[PDB]
Amino acid sequence: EETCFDKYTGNTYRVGDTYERPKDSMIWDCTCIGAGRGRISCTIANRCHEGGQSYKIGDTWRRPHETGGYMLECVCLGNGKGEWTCKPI
């Protein structure tokens, strides 16, 4: 069985396993690819890292609008671009 070991999580994964790796004050979405080299690919392209937190696609959060009169609700869209959008509450 081909595996990947992640030195941060301390776990051994099989090919195709996905998992979270907290690092750099963010959360990386990692995949054990293997490829005969214990190849791991990790990405934040489908997370939003905003207001010091890590959000998955569909997660929401709040931040004040620049005018200060009202709050925004934001949602993480991802789109391989860490895309998020916010509407007034």
Binding site: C4, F5, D6, K7, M26, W28, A35, R37, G38, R39, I40, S41, C42, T43, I44, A45, R47, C48, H49, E50, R63, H65, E66, L72, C74, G80, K81, G82, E83, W84, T85, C86, K87, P88
Partner: peptide, 18 residues
């Protein structure tokens, strides 16, 4: 009245057994 943006967008590939 709203706001939108893009977070840091990075992909890392590591060969743990090169």
């Amino acid at each position: 009245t709203g706001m939108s943006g893009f977070s840091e967008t990075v992909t890392i590939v590591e060969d743990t057994r090169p």
